Scaffold this active site. Structure first.
Site, PDB file in Angstrom:
ATOM      1  CG  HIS A   1      -2.674   7.678  -0.480  1.00  0.00           C
ATOM      2  ND1 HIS A   1      -2.941   8.585  -0.826  1.00  0.00           N
ATOM      3  CD2 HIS A   1      -2.718   7.390   0.890  1.00  0.00           C
ATOM      4  CE1 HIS A   1      -3.130   9.520   0.600  1.00  0.00           C
ATOM      5  NE2 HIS A   1      -3.175   8.499   1.286  1.00  0.00           N
TER       6      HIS A   1
ATOM      7  CG  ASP B   1      -6.277  10.538   1.629  1.00  0.00           C
ATOM      8  OD1 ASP B   1      -6.624   9.290   1.758  1.00  0.00           O
ATOM      9  OD2 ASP B   1      -5.527  10.902   2.230  1.00  0.00           O
TER      10      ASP B   1
ATOM     11  CG  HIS C   1      -8.441   9.518   4.966  1.00  0.00           C
ATOM     12  ND1 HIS C   1      -9.029  10.210   6.015  1.00  0.00           N
ATOM     13  CD2 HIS C   1      -7.108   9.712   4.936  1.00  0.00           C
ATOM     14  CE1 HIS C   1      -7.957  10.935   6.773  1.00  0.00           C
ATOM     15  NE2 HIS C   1      -6.750  10.640   6.173  1.00  0.00           N
TER      16      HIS C   1
HETATM   17 MN   LIG Z   1      -3.460  10.113   2.991  1.00  0.00          MN
HETATM   18 MN   LIG Z   2      -4.219  12.877   3.139  1.00  0.00          MN
END
Ligand SMILES: [Mn+2]
Ligand SMILES: [Mn+2]
Lengths: 117, 290, 322, 580, 274, 69
Positions: free
Chosen positions: B162, B80, B113
């Site tokens: 993540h 991210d 992302h």
């Molecule tokens: Mn995330």
């Molecule tokens: Mn995030």
């Protein structure tokens, strides 16, 4: 104003896995979640109240009865452990007794005075 | 053949984006560097673990002032680096340039992302379009995101990723065997690996998001015991306090973005593993702005 | 510049430091006509600027784009090609038809090859490629006959006939080699065609058309192995084909001395010899034992495990075996 | 159709995707270059005049491209032909499109010749002013400034009248646009004309029922506070000034307080004193935090520009009780705003006045809960220390400073750090050694890296200030103790300390203390430590003795060059090249 | 060749603040596991074990000439106990191979099998011991399927241009194909593809192994397909009678792979003749 | 002792020998003039409550969920 009682099996047999990789109890929780999601599509769904009963002992079988908000139902539903017997009969009796708890006090069953739909 | 790269790093620290040719060369170098990294990137124990940045570049500089300047401080970013911020391009370019220059002293893991669809929707694509007048830079960066390692492994004990765990993943060997060089799917191992969250729950559960799963304490306990892991570091979720232990100190969520869309007001924190894994969290507030 | 920018200015052609322009013009024309004709003329002019380096256009431009380009070239320059023939025609039409047939057979061969998996408008392009490949497969025989007939003729912006003949016979050999997987006579024809290609290359001795030398050497080696009409590997293959197995043993001993042949090849020939022995001739027991002993000794020298076949062959051992 | 390039090509590009349309907009110059200039105008500009349905993105780029027609249109005799399509785009409902439109219009108007500018733009200005769409009038607002310094007197007066008529428009967007553009318009107009035309109806605009119009009227008011003569400035500005200052709308009062300093500096000292001393105190005493914060920001600039003869009296009489009441305000943001420049008044007030009135306020600020307040107040200790003297501050604020040094927020800590050279210069070595030296060492082990590097720089300042043997007696043992730390970051703080100290620590001290310490650190397992050692040897190389340089540094750098880690290799090679 | 003072010192290290908030887990990881043994001794220990196994498996007696035949019953016993030891023989244990969708659905078991093969080189030797007797290798269908699925996953995931950057996986693919050829689960044409694996790119060798998977889907390692040749007391797999035994589409794929890299693979073209 | 919440600072029996000295130093420093960050997951990123508790600032002038709307 309907009532939706989810008699989730919490017998240890619900720890069986499937090709999904999740246990049967996980798929039961997901089934309840998706049932809520599909139910919410209807405008009439704002009036329902959910109930939760499990295959535990009577003092702990009911964990979302009357006077229980939706958040409490969700919190109880998440933290379900499949660790009991498959005591289907006793739990079903508990569920029916819970549903018929308030019938006599409000006299909805007009005993000896015909049946009122 | 490296003075230009130090000049780029110095330029990026002042928040000045590189030209398209520079970004192309940087992406080429990074691709030639990231291909030699396994999906479970081994990391030496002294390292400062940092969570999400989300393109909040001034907050990234705040983070650097907190934990120190690389290469003097080892870093580990768990995805991210883009979207939900007005300086995504500068942030990701600086991180990739640091990765190229100091590949041993910094590790960058793929986020949720780091995907073509998410960048198209959430405004990294729009930021690239505005700042460069075309989609070429966005194409170059999104091609690079396929090569970012899925996870890391600090000293064989701390497992940094993540997102959360997956029902189909219960071994580090499975993660090592994945084919990361592809778009994040709508399901399957790596999608859950990047999108899943923990929860005060028993067993698995469908995530409130459109992808991934929610795993309870017992899941993380079994995963940790099976894989010989003491902790599962994670960065996918917002944390008001900056960091937050979960599941009886088996999982810690680290958020390194003070504020999230410059409106949430959340604090940030970064874990600092020393030479003997004696951890320490260094919280910080958003840097002053004009 | 871009597709529209180059339409009015005629100076970027000789200045830019090309395939991008070609695909841009083709895409602009593809949108559902003086402008279309102008774009096609510009595309043909820039294509001619590269001197029709069909490898570059084939690899860079897509299949339907190059198909449309060649069809447009055929339409502007001329107009059953097999019935057409007429090599005594203008050089422009001749080279256009030659290039089209070369592209046809090369695209057939390339589509035969495998490509890396598509991990991620592209669907429509894929459908167009499939349809074009299907229709190309339909009339492949006509195209290859036209190319062969043109190659046979030697009555030649015209270019040297030697280079054109070398390129077209190389493509003919490749087409036959792809075709020859299910027919050995076609492999013989391909071998003859590649020998003709090599002879032409030797005769002209050019260094300026573009032919992959490594690929040509590989084709020559493959044709020599398949239809010989030297090296110990080829010697073992020939002996296996004929049945001079004692020579195979002697080559194997020399190979133990030199450590030249692949271990995999030796294990494979041992396996096939064992299969033949277990199927047919009883005299193959001794030959199988001998080659197995050679393989076992090579494995011992290289530091690898002793095979199970050696272990079972040394039950009930005899004087001659030891 | 298809044969003719411009219309067909641009129409088909419009039919394509929007980004291709943006590419076409930059391509507009090329089609103009290819076609004749007369062809360009007479054909394309009518097409550009209408049939536009792409309000989202391409219009700003289109306006920018039209503003770039330096010679493509041909010249001013054709720039006036270029004017109508911008007018058509000037009526676009989107605001930013109109902004870029008026920008391009101003640019081309500057490009115009005088006679062409009047004879062509003036009808357009009337048309936009007289347009049925309010958007046309809002666009027209900008153009009134550019025509004035080149057109003749009668058209000047007509333009002024048309602007004045425009201000009477019922729709509030038009009045907002007029008010926003009023500053430059009145700036370029003649002062007598400014007075006679603008000022009555400008005051009427300031009295308008629309609050936003009043904010922009305040903007105009502060803008035009310097062009009028003094007596007329008084009679025409002061009633409006007090009217705006005491306005009901809190936004108006906030805007009045925000632009107070330039309003004050432009209308003379005594006038500001007399007819703004109650208003300014009123602004700080308001019931909303926004205007109070703005006024608190402007307090220092308000005070410093007054006439010195009666500045202290007016300050101590009016402002000081208000500041005292303000320091205790519940809202933390106004306290933070005040804390930025509250101690800037101390040189102005004087020694005794600061000690009596301002010192308890400073002590209250230092012990405030809000960290922003603590950040702001600490940021300017230099001036108060300079004007009050080290003795009074040391007796008064030193324990508070020490308490602040232990604050949670690292920004506060580094704010405290920066003054240790300042305190050191004005105070003896013994007292600093027995009070703050261990405190200075405490910052070196701090978690935040900024704190550690700030303390490192301060250590450099102290060693160059408080001598060399003092550092050996006080600082160097703690650095050596830090060299044995297990955590690597403390060792990196040690290496940075060696870097800063070695320049001003003297050759003999530097070698015979640092070199045994630095050389042992070269065998550390962490690669960070090794390459930092290499960098440190490279940096402190030329400053030490030569025989020791060779005999000690060269073998270990040779060792580091063959070390497996890439960064250690690079930095060791760089150090060897530097040493030569 | 298989694979596999506190408090006082703490006070010594300990200025008057903890700095670090705590120790993550049980402190530092150990100094890791190490191993070392002469490879010659490993080879000859494996030789002794395999010689004993061949002695126990080969039938008694007799005649004065003719090498003995490995008993398919003994080799079947070795096969089934190998399957029990390595993997749990849990699911998909039927000898008929499933689609590749099932290969993607059981990747965990495949990776377990692959890791077991990687740690213990003795498994391949026992595999070719089983493969010496023709019918027995069919019962290792789960083992072969899992190892092949693991190798397919590795080759799909591989990013190097050359196949030699993965030494063990290349060797394992070659050995796996050779063992399948020895047990007559593949025709001679497919059986020779391990000779060319060392030259190809990862996607090409993955395509060839997927062709092997497809062929085994079409025909399958069914012991009933093995016809007992009483002429020598041995089971023999007849591919000519099987129909499409040469593997038409599979040989087409192999020919395409060879043709693409014809510059380096010209000499190997003869190994795949009919 | 599930959900015990061991009061390590308050009770000296809850200190493991593994980390006795470090906790000793921490409780010593805490005691002089000089359990948190284990909030439940639901209350971990509920910015609404945290902002409501905090003082207000100056007044104002494909997958589905990705947090913060
Ligand atoms: Mn995330
Ligand atoms: Mn995030």
């Amino acid at each position: 104003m309907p009532i939706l009682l989810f008699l989730i099996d919490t017998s240890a047999s619900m720890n069986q896995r499937s090709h999904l990789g999740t246990t049967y109890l996980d798929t039961a929780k997901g089934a309840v979640e998706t049932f809520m999601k599909l139910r919410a599509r209807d405008p009439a769904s704002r009036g329902d109240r959910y109930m939760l009963v499990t295959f535990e002992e009577p003092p702990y079988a009911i964990k979302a009865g009357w006077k229980e908000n939706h958040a409490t139902f969700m919190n109880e539903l998440k933290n379900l452990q499949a660790e009991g017997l498959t005591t289907l009969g006793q739990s079903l009796r508990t569920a029916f007794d819970l549903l018929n708890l308030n019938r006599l006090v409000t006299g909805i069953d007009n005993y000896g005075q015909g049946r009122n739909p | 053949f490296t003075k230009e790269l130090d000049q780029w790093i110095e330029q990026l620290n002042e928040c000045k984006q590189l030209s398209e040719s520079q970004v192309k060369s940087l992406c080429e170098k990074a691709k030639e560097i990231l291909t030699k990294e396994s999906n479970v990137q081994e990391v030496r124990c002294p390292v400062t673990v940092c969570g999400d940045v989300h393109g909040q570049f001034h907050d990234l500089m705040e983070l650097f002032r907190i934990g120190g300047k690389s290469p003097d401080t080892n870093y580990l970013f768990m995805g991210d680096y883009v979207n939900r911020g007005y300086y995504s391009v500068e942030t990701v370019t600086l991180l990739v340039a640091l990765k190229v220059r100091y590949r041993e002293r910094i590790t960058i893991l793929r986020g949720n992302h780091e995907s073509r669809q998410i960048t198209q929707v959430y405004g990294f694509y729009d930021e690239c379009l505005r700042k460069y007048g075309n989609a070429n830079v966005w194409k170059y960066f999104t091609d690079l995101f396929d090569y970012l390692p899925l996870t890391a492994l600090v000293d064989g004990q701390i497992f940094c990723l993540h997102g959360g765990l997956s029902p189909s993943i219960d071994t580090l060997d499975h993660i090592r065997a994945l084919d990361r060089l592809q778009e994040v799917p709508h399901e399957g191992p790596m999608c859950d690996l990047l999108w899943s969250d923990p929860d005060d729950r028993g067993g698995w559960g469908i995530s409130p998001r459109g992808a991934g799963y929610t795993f309870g304490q017992d899941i993380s306990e079994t995963f940790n015991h099976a894989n010989g892991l003491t902790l599962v570091s994670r960065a996918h979720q917002l944390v008001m306090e900056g960091y937050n232990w979960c599941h009886d100190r088996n999982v810690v969520t680290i958020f390194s973005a003070p504020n999230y869309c410059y409106r949430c007001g959340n604090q940030a924190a970064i874990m600092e593993l020393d030479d003997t894994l004696k951890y320490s969290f260094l919280q910080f507030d958003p840097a002053p702005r004009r | 510049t871009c597709w529209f920018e180059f339409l009015l200015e005629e100076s970027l052609l000789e200045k830019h430091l090309p395939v991008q322009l070609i695909v841009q013009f083709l895409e602009q024309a593809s949108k559902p006509n003086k402008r279309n004709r102008i774009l096609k003329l510009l595309a043909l002019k820039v294509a001619a600027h590269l001197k029709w380096d069909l490898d570059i256009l084939e690899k860079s431009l897509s299949v339907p784009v190059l198909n449309m380009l060649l069809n447009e070239l055929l339409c502007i320059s001329k107009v059953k090609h097999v019935d057409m023939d007429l090599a005594t025609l203008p050089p422009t039409t001749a080279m256009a038809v030659l290039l089209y047939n070369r592209w046809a057979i090369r695209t057939i061969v390339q589509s035969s090859f495998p490509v890396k998996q598509a991990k991620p408008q592209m669907q429509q392009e894929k459908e167009l490629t499939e349809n074009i490949l299907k229709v190309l497969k339909e009339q492949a025989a006509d195209s290859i006959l036209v190319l062969e007939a043109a190659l046979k003729l030697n009555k030649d912006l015209k270019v040297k006939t030697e280079e054109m003949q070398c390129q077209v016979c190389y493509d003919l050999g490749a087409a036959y080699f792809q075709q020859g997987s299910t027919n050995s006579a076609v492999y013989e024809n391909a071998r003859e065609k590649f020998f003709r290609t090599k002879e032409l290359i030797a005769e002209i001795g050019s260094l300026s058309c573009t032919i992959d030398e490594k690929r040509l050497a590989g084709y020559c080696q493959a044709c020599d192995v398949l239809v010989p009409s030297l090296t110990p590997y080829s010697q073992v293959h020939i002996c296996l084909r004929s049945g001079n197995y004692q020579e195979v043993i002697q080559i194997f001993i020399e190979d133990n001395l030199t450590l030249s042949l692949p271990v995999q090849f030796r294990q494979s020939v041992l396996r096939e010899l064992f299969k033949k022995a277990q199927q047919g001739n009883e005299a193959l027991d001794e030959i199988c034992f001998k080659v197995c002993a050679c393989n076992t000794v090579r494995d011992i020298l290289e530091g690898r495990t002793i095979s199970v076949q050696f272990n079972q062959l040394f039950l009930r051992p005899n004087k001659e075996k030891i | 159709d298809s044969l003719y390039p411009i219309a067909v090509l641009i129409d088909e590009l419009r039919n394509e995707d929007v980004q291709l349309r943006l590419n076409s907009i930059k391509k507009l110059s090329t089609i103009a270059l290819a076609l004749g200039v007369e062809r360009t105008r007479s054909e394309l500009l009518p097409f550009l005049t209408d049939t536009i349905y792409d309000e989202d993105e391409v219009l700003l780029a289109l306006a920018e491209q039209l503003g770039t027609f330096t010679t493509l249109v041909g010249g001013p005799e054709y720039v006036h032909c270029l004017l109508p399509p911008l007018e058509s785009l000037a009526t676009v409902e989107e605001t930013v499109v109109r902004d870029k439109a008026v920008e391009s219009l101003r640019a081309i108007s500057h490009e115009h010749s005088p006679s062409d500018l009047e004879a062509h733009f003036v009808p357009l200005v009337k048309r936009l002013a007289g347009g049925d769409w309010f958007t046309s009038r809002t666009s027209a607002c900008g153009l009134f400034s550019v025509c004035y310094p080149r057109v003749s007197s009668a058209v000047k007066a007509e333009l002024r009248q048309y602007f004045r008529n425009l201000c009477s428009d019922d729709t509030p967007m038009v009045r907002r646009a007029a008010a926003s553009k009023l500053g430059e318009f009145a700036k370029v107009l003649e002062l007598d004309n400014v007075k006679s035309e603008i000022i009555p109806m400008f005051s009427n605009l300031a009295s308008d029922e629309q609050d936003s119009v009043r904010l922009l009227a305040v903007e105009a008011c502060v803008n035009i506070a310097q062009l009028l003569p003094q007596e007329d400035l008084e009679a025409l500005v002061m009633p409006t000034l007090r009217q705006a200052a005491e306005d009901k709308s809190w936004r108006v009062r906030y805007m009045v307080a925000d632009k107070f300093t330039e309003l004050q500096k432009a209308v003379g000292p005594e006038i500001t004193k007399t007819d703004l001393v109650p208003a300014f105190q009123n602004l700080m005493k308001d019931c909303e935090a926004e205007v109070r914060a703005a006024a608190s920001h402007k307090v220092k600039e308000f005070c410093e520009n007054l006439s010195a003869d009666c500045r202290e009296n007016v300050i101590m009489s009016q402002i000081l009780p208000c500041i005292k009441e303000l320091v205790s305000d519940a809202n933390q943001h106004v306290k933070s705003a005040l804390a930025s420049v509250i101690m800037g008044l101390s040189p102005i007030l004087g020694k005794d006045n600061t000690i009596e009135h301002l010192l308890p306020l400073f002590l209250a600020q230092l012990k405030d809960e809000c960290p922003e307040v603590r950040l702001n107040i600490i940021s300017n200790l230099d001036c108060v220390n300079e004007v009050i003297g080290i003795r009074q501050l040391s007796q008064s604020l030193l324990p508070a400073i020490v308490e602040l040094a232990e604050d949670a927020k690292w920004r506060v800590r580094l704010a405290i750090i920066e003054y240790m050279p300042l305190l050191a210069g004005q105070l003896g070595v013994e007292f600093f050694d027995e009070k703050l030296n261990s405190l200075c060492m405490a910052w070196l082990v701090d978690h935040v890296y900024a704190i550690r590097e700030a303390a490192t720089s301060n250590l450099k300042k102290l060693v160059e200030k408080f001598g060399k043997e003092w550092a050996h007696a006080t600082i160097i043992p703690k650095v050596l103790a830090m060299s044995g730390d297990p955590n690597y970051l403390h060792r990196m703080t040690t290496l940075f300390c060696i870097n800063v100290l070695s320049e001003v620590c003297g050759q003999d001290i530097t070698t015979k203390h640092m070199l045994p310490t630095v050389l042992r650190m070269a065998g550390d397992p962490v690669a960070n430590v090794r390459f930092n050692v290499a960098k440190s040897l490279q940096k402190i190389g030329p400053i030490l003795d030569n025989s020791t340089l060779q005999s000690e540094v060269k073998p270990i750098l040779e060792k580091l060059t063959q070390d497996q880690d890439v960064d250690v290799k690079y930095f060791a090679q760089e150090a060897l090249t530097v040493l030569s | 060749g298989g694979q596999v003072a506190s408090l006082l010192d703490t006070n010594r290290r300990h200025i008057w603040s903890v700095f670090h908030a705590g120790v993550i887990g049980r402190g530092l990881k150990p100094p890791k596991f190490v191993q070392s043994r002469n490879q010659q001794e490993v080879i000859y220990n494996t030789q002794s074990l395999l010689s004993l196994l061949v002695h126990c498996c080969s039938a008694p007696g007799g005649e004065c000439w003719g090498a003995p035949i490995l008993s398919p019953e003994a080799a079947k016993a070795v096969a089934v106990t190998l399957v029990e030891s390595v993997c749990p023989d849990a699911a998909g244990a039927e000898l008929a191979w499933p689609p590749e969708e099932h290969a993607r659905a059981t990747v965990e078991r495949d990776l377990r099998i692959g890791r077991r093969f990687r740690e213990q080189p003795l498994l391949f030797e026992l595999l070719k011991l089983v493969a010496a007797a023709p019918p027995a290798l069919c019962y290792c269908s789960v083992l072969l399927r899992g190892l092949l699925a693991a190798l397919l996953g590795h080759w799909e995931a591989s990013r190097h241009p050359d196949t030699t950057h993965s030494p063990w996986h290349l060797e394992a693919s070659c050995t796996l194909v050779a063992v399948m050829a020895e047990g007559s689960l593949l025709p001679p044409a497919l059986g020779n593809m391990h000779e060319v694996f060392s030259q190809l790119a990862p996607f090409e060798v993955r395509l060839l192994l997927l062709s092997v998977w497809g062929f085994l889907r079409e025909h399958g390692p069914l012991p009933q397909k093995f016809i007992f040749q009483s002429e020598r007391g041995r089971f023999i797999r007849d591919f000519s009678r099987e129909g499409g035994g040469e593997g038409g589409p599979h040989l087409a794929v192999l020919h395409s792979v060879l043709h693409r890299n014809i510059d380096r693979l010209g000499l190997f073209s003869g190994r795949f003749q009919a | 002792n599930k959900d015990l919440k061991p009061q390590t600072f308050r009770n000296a029996y809850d200190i493991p020998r593994r980390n006795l000295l470090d906790h000793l130093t921490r409780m010593r420093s805490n005691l002089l003039k000089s359990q948190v960050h284990s909030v439940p997951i639901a209350q971990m990123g509920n910015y609404q409550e945290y902002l409501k508790q905090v003082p207000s600032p100056l007044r104002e002038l494909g997958m589905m969920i990705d947090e913060a709307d």
